[PDB]
Amino acid sequence: RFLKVKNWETDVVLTDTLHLKSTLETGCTEHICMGSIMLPSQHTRKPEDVATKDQLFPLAKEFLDQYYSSIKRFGSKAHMDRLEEVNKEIESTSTYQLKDTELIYGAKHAWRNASRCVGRIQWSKLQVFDARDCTTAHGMFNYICNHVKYATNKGNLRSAITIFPQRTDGKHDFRVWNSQLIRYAGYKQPDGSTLGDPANVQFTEICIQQGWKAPRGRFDVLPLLLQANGNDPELFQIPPELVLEVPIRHPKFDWFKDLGLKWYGLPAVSNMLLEIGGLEFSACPFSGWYMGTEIGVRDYCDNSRYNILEEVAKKMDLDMRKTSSLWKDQALVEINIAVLYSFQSDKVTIVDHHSATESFIKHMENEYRCRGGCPADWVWIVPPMSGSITPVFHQEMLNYRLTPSFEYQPDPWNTHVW
Ligand code: HEM
Ligand SMILES: CNCc1cc(-c2cc(C)cc(N)n2)cc(C(F)(F)F)c1
Ligand SMILES: C[C@H](O)[C@H](O)[C@H]1CNc2nc(N)[nH]c(=O)c2N1
Ligand SMILES: [Zn+2]
Numbered sequence: 001r002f003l004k005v006k007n008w009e010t011d012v013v014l015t016d017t018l019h020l021k022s023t024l025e026t027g028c029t030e031h032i033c034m035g036s037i038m039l040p041s042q043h044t045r046k047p048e049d050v051a052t053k054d055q056l057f058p059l060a061k062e063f064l065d066q067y068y069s070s071i072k073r074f075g076s077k078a079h080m081d082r083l084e085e086v087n088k089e090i091e092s093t094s095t096y097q098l099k100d101t102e103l104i105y106g107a108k109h110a111w112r113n114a115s116r117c118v119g120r121i122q123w124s125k126l127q128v129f130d131a132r133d134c135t136t137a138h139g140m141f142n143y144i145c146n147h148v149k150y151a152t153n154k155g156n157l158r159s160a161i162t163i164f165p166q167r168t169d170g171k172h173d174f175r176v177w178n179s180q181l182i183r184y185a186g187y188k189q190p191d192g193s194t195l196g197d198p199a200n201v202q203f204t205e206i207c208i209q210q211g212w213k214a215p216r217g218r219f220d221v222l223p224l225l226l227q228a229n230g231n232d233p234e235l236f237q238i239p240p241e242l243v244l245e246v247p248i249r250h251p252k253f254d255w256f257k258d259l260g261l262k263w264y265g266l267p268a269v270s271n272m273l274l275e276i277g278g279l280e281f282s283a284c285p286f287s288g289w290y291m292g293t294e295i296g297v298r299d300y301c302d303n304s305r306y307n308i309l310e311e312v313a314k315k316m317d318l319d320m321r322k323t324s325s326l327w328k329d330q331a332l333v334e335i336n337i338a339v340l341y342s343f344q345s346d347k348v349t350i351v352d353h354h355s356a357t358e359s360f361i362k363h364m365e366n367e368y369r370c371r372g373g374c375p376a377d378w379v380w381i382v383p384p385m386s387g388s389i390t391p392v393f394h395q396e397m398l399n400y401r402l403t404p405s406f407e408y409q410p411d412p413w414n415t416h417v418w
Pocket of ligand 3: 035036037038379380381
């Protein structure tokens with residue numbers, strides 16, 4: 001009931017007691033482990049799972065008890081009256097509203113509890129933008145531009161989240177239909193192949209079906225498609241001066257510029273759902289900075305993404321006949337050297353997978369010491385390249401689900417009553 005986790009590189013043992021406070025389920029049973037299912041049935045919030053008023057107060061109490069425990073005023077009159085006040089408000093409204101202080105605590109701890117995030121060492125330095133007074137898609141557009149400009153900070157990137165009004169009935173739902181705020185377009189070709197980013201080919205067409213005029217090229221920054229209070233979503237173009245991009249060059253290979261690759265500086269997930277004290281925030285774009293491998297390995301070299309191992313090994317002139325020449329591996333390392341070098345020489349914040357995984361072990365030690373545990377998903381924490389030469393490969397990690405949390409949710413174009 002007080003489980004142990006070992007680092008087999010260092011023989012370090014940590015003791016997890018935090019998992020006891022866990023409430024959500026994981027998908028695994030005593031007889032089957034689901035730790036490699038990408039979007040487990042549990043990790044999703046459908047708009048039908050509107051917690052009724054009966055369900056709402058325990059969730060509200062539980063969250064309020066840890067918040068007041070966090071500010072060392074647990075059990076005081078202030079806690080008791082806030083407990084009573086929200087109880088009364090859930091009676092009256094069948095929902096309730098978070099204080100600004102409770103919203104910042106909730107948001108920071110959803111990040112803190114994100115077992116799949118390797119960058120959590122920074123969880124307490126997060127800038128919370130309260131957009132719960134927003135009412136229109138134009139207002140959403142304005143909040144989001146302000147978020148991008150703030151978080152980008154001229155390349156000195158700053159973590160942030162913008163929180164739009166919470167779900168109520170489920171049919172009046174604020175949603176950012178983009179999966180990230182800044183993404184490159186993807187166009188299918190007349191010959192079947194794909195221009196830009198194959199991930200977004202359906203989303204790119206949805207923007208055109210709603211009227212987007214596509215420059216039909218590679219790295220075309222998509223428009224924001226914003227839905228407000230359940231209304232049909234409307235297209236907006238982020239001012240280009242607000243979208244900071246890094247041209248990718250290599251510190252040895254001068255032919256690397258002619259590849260003509262670039263990437264945006266700001267990773268800003270926009271499709272997920274923030275859950276706090278039983279309330280569901282369907283639109284909550286949050287941004288940080290990139291770990292290099294996200295761009296260099298997954299974005300650039302996933303078979304179904306930009307898939308550039310081909311041309312890079314070509315220009316490196318590699319033994320591309322044999323599978324066992326590791327030409328793929330060889331081109332992958334050079335590509336990721338280039339991503340880091342470009343961002344750093346341009347003063348845009350980026351972290352390499354070695355520094356990031358070291359910081360997460362260090363972060364893990366802090367959580368087990370001053371919190372009693374740290375939920376962690378090894379399948380996601382280990383970087384997609386050079387796994388065992390980073391310290392997180394050798395670290396045992398207990399995965400469990402704590403609230404407040406970030407959840408996945410259906411893409412809005414499958415649930416929307418147009
Ligand atoms: C500050 C710098 C940050 C870095 C370097 C970072 C890094 C990462 C990486 C590498 C992943 C794996 C995703 C993938 O490989 O496709 C991830 C996932 C994730 N990040 Fe972080 N992140 C940062 C900040 C944040 C912030 C500010 C939030 C929210 C406020 C956040 C929440 C999440 C969540 C919720 C997931 C995974 C969702 C899931 O499937 O469970 N991260 N992050
Ligand atoms: C390969 N990058 C795609 C991807 C990136 C990120 C992400 C998010 C943040 C705030 C920072 C960062 N550095 N990355 C999060 C996800 C997801 F969807 F898992 F949450 C996916
Ligand atoms: C099948 C598997 O669950 C899926 O490929 C996961 C594995 N681990 C991952 N880890 C990270 N960081 N990001 C991912 O997209 C994935 N994908
Ligand atoms: Zn399991």
